[PDB]
RNA sequence: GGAACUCUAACAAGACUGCCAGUGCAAACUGUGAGGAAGGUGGGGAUGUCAAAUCAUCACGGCCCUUACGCCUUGGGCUACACACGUGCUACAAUGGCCGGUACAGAGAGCAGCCACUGGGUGACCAGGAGCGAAUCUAUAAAGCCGGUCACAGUUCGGAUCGGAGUCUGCAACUCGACUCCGUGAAGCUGGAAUCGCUAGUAAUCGGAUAUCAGCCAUGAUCCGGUGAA
RNA sequence: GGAACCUUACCAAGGCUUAAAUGCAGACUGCGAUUUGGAAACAGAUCUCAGUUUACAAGGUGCUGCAU
């Protein structure tokens, strides 16, 4: 969750912006090995915390719980059935 | 009869008795029987000698014997005598397919030393 | 990599082709142990990084199916 | 009135009865089970449901 | 402090329209399978047709009904109804030790009226000993 | 005469020879216990829902409503977190 | 082509021991009748010391390093293995296995995709190619039923181990992925004191879905549906 | 509640010091493809919001949940 480690994700995301037509055209691949979609781990996008992630809200479980409790996500309620 | 070297069906069903031969199994035995043309439900103690020979001819097609036994033996000896990871693993007697040599490795290691 | 095309590193292949063309020379140093042994690698000596050092391997003929990392043990148990 | 959707059962209804001047279509209810404590108390979760209502 | 009981009412079976057959197949069930238990019971009672009907089975179910149980190891009567649950449980438990082929085959112990009366005899012999309590 | 069965999950709409979903009484209830549970003594049912026993109990409830009438309120209990099933927990030690 | 039903989702009724019997100044229990229901209908969210877990979700008082205990990379380790305790799955069999016929769902997901259909291949899968950003289109349940076999043992039960040949993802499958396929049948024939869960759609058993998503260890976790006890 | 790289915080070895990201402070103007050394990071050329000095911060999944 360090600043360097969370900025590494942004650097890799900015690196995988080009080469979108190069990787689309088992050989002929001399790349910086960072322009691949297999190295993009998803963070919490506020704190930058791995080990728990929801694609819908894009944040970790602890931030999701705290915001859903203190009314920051429209729609969430207390599930009961 | 003795389809393979010394194996004996001895009144069992065709497939269940022919799968007793080392090298040949359920699938290839069923394939052999379907290509030679004998019912699988009938027993072995009543097969005619013509059917016996017709099945022998097609069982002598696959490498199913001590020959294949020692073929895979030379395979493991080849991968062993060159210094491979699988070679040293076979030499020392621990699981080779990437299983955890921690707990649940008894069938490969042995009893409690 | 799995019968859709043999996988050998570009740099490794380029540096061993010139060696096999010039004949017999010094050991070839590498880190990419993920390369598969090629019939162009026979009779050659490779110092491959293992975890901290470089273990040598002499490709005679028989490892042509195995990878360049099947040798060079990584963990030292006893 | 063609399909309109919201996240509350009393706001989209007022919007739709406003449109009808100026059909249920069952709601979509998602559910999440989130661990409560930030450190190990694993046998203590919390369920959070998200409704999505849509009508026309 | 259980304070109540409900006895879990039952419903009869199509064949023999009897209420004891339902209890028997309920004690016979395994992993929640009633159809195969009914099938096994029907095959067993049809195999028993060698020698009458399920009457002989229900009368053999009587010889396994104890009248006093030990539970300082004091004897006491069980209940007017738990007798026909101990009898069924003992029959079904000791019919699974017979080294026959199928379940319907090894269930042919109703004619042994054979590891079922032995339990009642041992219970009576152990209850008549501690009669001074 | 119309009737609604409404067992555990099955729903049968009895429309009172005993035909079921354009089929016969044997292609839908082969078992003896399935042919039973019709203890009432031009019938369409249009059943849809749970299992065979559930549908049988539903058509029984409907044929009892058109004349057993007690609708069984039993439903599948919800699985609760921290457990393995609805009413069974895990296994612990040192207690 | 229809507005009666199921259904969906908004509003209402219905359970208040209220009705009828006995006890009691009173609350209140013990039974019956009506009813879909009973006596908080059932299940959940609600939760009024141990200097207990986290300075690794986050913030922060104090101390320490800043040619660095800070920072970008490649390779490796987190999978190491003589042993142990805990949590799980499967099998130890014929109310069972196998080849066949025949049915019955629910919820949830789908352009970070679901795939109808056709052609190649035993198979995983590949090529072509509709429909669908969702009561519209796709994703084909098992147990169960009927018929034949096996007729009892390390077996036509069992599934670990190992060799060879392939498919998918990804720059990369040896350390360390999954699946298919042809070989093979190790320990296991109800487990010692001791200990665990469960009072009704419960336990037991069978199947399906979701979450992290390039793939995946998934037998873990969260749910749903079927059969169903003492 | 997804360890092949990535996650990764650990280890061995190559490359950095006002910083691999963010505010600032004072100048000098209007992203891409090609080529060499390489395991990459990074260095040296063509070419057409970005690039470079000086003093500033910065940073740590570093230690104590018995300061919070």
UniProtKB/TrEMBL annotation, chain A:
<dbReference type="Pfam" id="PF00253">
    <property type="entry name" value="Ribosomal_S14"/>
</dbReference>
<dbReference type="InterPro" id="IPR043140">
    <property type="entry name" value="Ribosomal_uS14_sf"/>
</dbReference>
<dbReference type="GO" id="GO:0005737">
    <property type="term" value="C:cytoplasm"/>
</dbReference>
<protein>
    <recommendedName>
        <fullName>Small ribosomal subunit protein uS14</fullName>
    </recommendedName>
</protein>
<dbReference type="InterPro" id="IPR023036">
    <property type="entry name" value="Ribosomal_uS14_bac/plastid"/>
</dbReference>
<keyword id="KW-0689">Ribosomal protein</keyword>
<comment type="similarity">
    <text>Belongs to the universal ribosomal protein uS14 family.</text>
</comment>
<dbReference type="InterPro" id="IPR001209">
    <property type="entry name" value="Ribosomal_uS14"/>
</dbReference>
<keyword id="KW-0687">Ribonucleoprotein</keyword>
<comment type="function">
    <text>Binds 16S rRNA, required for the assembly of 30S particles and may also be responsible for determining the conformation of the 16S rRNA at the A site.</text>
</comment>
<dbReference type="GO" id="GO:0015935">
    <property type="term" value="C:small ribosomal subunit"/>
</dbReference>
<dbReference type="GO" id="GO:0019843">
    <property type="term" value="F:rRNA binding"/>
</dbReference>
UniProtKB/TrEMBL annotation, chain C:
<keyword id="KW-0699">rRNA-binding</keyword>
<protein>
    <recommendedName>
        <fullName>Small ribosomal subunit protein uS19</fullName>
    </recommendedName>
</protein>
<keyword id="KW-0689">Ribosomal protein</keyword>
<dbReference type="GO" id="GO:0005737">
    <property type="term" value="C:cytoplasm"/>
</dbReference>
<keyword id="KW-0687">Ribonucleoprotein</keyword>
<comment type="function">
    <text>Protein S19 forms a complex with S13 that binds strongly to the 16S ribosomal RNA.</text>
</comment>
<keyword id="KW-0694">RNA-binding</keyword>
<dbReference type="GO" id="GO:0019843">
    <property type="term" value="F:rRNA binding"/>
</dbReference>
<dbReference type="GO" id="GO:0015935">
    <property type="term" value="C:small ribosomal subunit"/>
</dbReference>
<dbReference type="GO" id="GO:0000028">
    <property type="term" value="P:ribosomal small subunit assembly"/>
</dbReference>
<dbReference type="GO" id="GO:0006412">
    <property type="term" value="P:translation"/>
</dbReference>
<comment type="similarity">
    <text>Belongs to the universal ribosomal protein uS19 family.</text>
</comment>
From TrEMBL, chain D:
<dbReference type="GO" id="GO:0005840">
    <property type="term" value="C:ribosome"/>
</dbReference>
<comment type="similarity">
    <text>Belongs to the universal ribosomal protein uS10 family.</text>
</comment>
<keyword id="KW-0687">Ribonucleoprotein</keyword>
<dbReference type="GO" id="GO:1990904">
    <property type="term" value="C:ribonucleoprotein complex"/>
</dbReference>
<dbReference type="GO" id="GO:0006412">
    <property type="term" value="P:translation"/>
</dbReference>
<dbReference type="GO" id="GO:0003735">
    <property type="term" value="F:structural constituent of ribosome"/>
</dbReference>
<comment type="subunit">
    <text>Part of the 30S ribosomal subunit.</text>
</comment>
<comment type="function">
    <text>Involved in the binding of tRNA to the ribosomes.</text>
</comment>
<dbReference type="GO" id="GO:0000049">
    <property type="term" value="F:tRNA binding"/>
</dbReference>
<protein>
    <recommendedName>
        <fullName>Small ribosomal subunit protein uS10</fullName>
    </recommendedName>
</protein>
<keyword id="KW-0689">Ribosomal protein</keyword>
Automatic annotation (TrEMBL), chain F:
<keyword id="KW-0689">Ribosomal protein</keyword>
<dbReference type="InterPro" id="IPR020568">
    <property type="entry name" value="Ribosomal_Su5_D2-typ_SF"/>
</dbReference>
<dbReference type="InterPro" id="IPR000754">
    <property type="entry name" value="Ribosomal_uS9"/>
</dbReference>
<protein>
    <recommendedName>
        <fullName>Small ribosomal subunit protein uS9</fullName>
    </recommendedName>
</protein>
<dbReference type="Pfam" id="PF00380">
    <property type="entry name" value="Ribosomal_S9"/>
</dbReference>
<dbReference type="GO" id="GO:0006412">
    <property type="term" value="P:translation"/>
</dbReference>
<dbReference type="GO" id="GO:0003723">
    <property type="term" value="F:RNA binding"/>
</dbReference>
<dbReference type="GO" id="GO:0022627">
    <property type="term" value="C:cytosolic small ribosomal subunit"/>
</dbReference>
<comment type="similarity">
    <text>Belongs to the universal ribosomal protein uS9 family.</text>
</comment>
<dbReference type="InterPro" id="IPR023035">
    <property type="entry name" value="Ribosomal_uS9_bac/plastid"/>
</dbReference>
<keyword id="KW-0687">Ribonucleoprotein</keyword>
<dbReference type="GO" id="GO:0003735">
    <property type="term" value="F:structural constituent of ribosome"/>
</dbReference>
């Amino acid at each position: 969750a360090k600043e360097s480690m969370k900025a590494r994700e942004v650097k890799r995301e900015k690196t995988v912006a080009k080469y979108a037509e190069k990787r689309k055209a088992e050989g002929l691949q001399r790349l910086p090995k960072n322009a691949s979609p297999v190295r993009l781990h998803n963070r919490c996008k506020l704190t930058g915390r791995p080990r728990g992630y929801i694609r819908q809200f894009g944040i970790s479980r602890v931030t999701f719980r705290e915001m859903a409790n203190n009314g920051l996500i429209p729609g969430v309620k207390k599930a009961s059935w | 009869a003795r389809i393979a070297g010394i194996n004996i069906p001895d009144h069992k069903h065709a497939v269940i008795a022919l799968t007793s031969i080392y090298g040949v199994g359920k699938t290839r035995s069923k394939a052999i029987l379907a290509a030679a043309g004998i019912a699988e439900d009938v027993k072995i103690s009543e097969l005619s000698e013509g059917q016996i020979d017709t099945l022998r001819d097609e069982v002598a097609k696959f490498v199913v014997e001590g020959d294949l036994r020692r073929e895979i033996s030379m395979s493991i000896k080849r991968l062993m005598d060159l210094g491979c990871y699988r070679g040293l693993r076979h030499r020392r007697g621990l699981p080779v397919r990437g299983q955890r040599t921690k707990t649940n490795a008894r069938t490969r290691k042995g009893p409690r030393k | 990599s799995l019968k859709k095309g043999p996988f050998v590193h570009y740099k490794l292949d380029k540096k061993v082709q010139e060696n096999v063309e010039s004949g017999k020379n010094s050991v070839v140093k590498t880190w990419s142990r993920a390369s598969m042994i090629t019939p162009d690698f026979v009779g050659q000596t490779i110092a491959v990084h293992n975890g901290r050092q470089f273990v040598p391997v002499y490709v005679t003929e028989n490892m042509v199916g195995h990878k360049l990392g099947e040798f060079s043990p990584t963990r030292s148990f006893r | 009135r063609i399909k309109l959707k919201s996240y509350d059962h009393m706001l989209v209804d007022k919007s739709a009865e406003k449109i009808v001047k100026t059909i249920p279509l069952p709601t979509h209810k998602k559910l999440f089970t989130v661990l409560r404590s930030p450190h190990v108390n694993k046998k203590a979760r919390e369920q959070f449901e998200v409704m999505s209502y849509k009508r026309l | 402090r259980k304070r109540a009981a409900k006895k879990r009412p039952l419903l009869p079976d199509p064949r023999f329209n009897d209420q004891l057959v339902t209890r028997f197949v309920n004690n016979l069930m395994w992993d929640g399978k009633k159809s195969t238990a009914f099938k096994v019971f029907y095959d067993a009672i049809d195999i028993i047709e060698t020698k009458t009907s399920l009457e002989i089975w229900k009368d053999a179910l009587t010889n396994v009904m104890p009248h006093v149980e030990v539970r300082f190891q004091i004897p006491m009567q069980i209940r007017p109804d738990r007798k026909i649950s101990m009898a069924m449980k003992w029959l079904i438990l000791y019919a699974r030790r017979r080294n026959e082929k199928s379940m319907a085959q090894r269930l042919a112990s109703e004619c042994l009226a054979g590891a079922a009366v032995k339990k009642r005899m041992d219970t009576h012999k152990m209850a008549e000993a501690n009669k001074a309590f | 005469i119309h009737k609604i069965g409404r067992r555990k999950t099955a729903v049968a709409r009895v429309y009172v020879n005993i035909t079921v979903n354009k089929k016969e009484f044997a292609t839908y209830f082969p078992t003896a216990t399935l042919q039973y549970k019709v203890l009432q003594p031009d019938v369409k049912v249009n059943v849809y829902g749970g299992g065979t026993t559930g549908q049988a109990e539903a058509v029984r409830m409907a044929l009892a409503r058109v004349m057993l009438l007690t609708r069984d309120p039993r439903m599948v209990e919800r699985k609760k977190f921290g457990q393995k099933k609805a009413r069974k927990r895990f296994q612990f030690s040192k207690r």
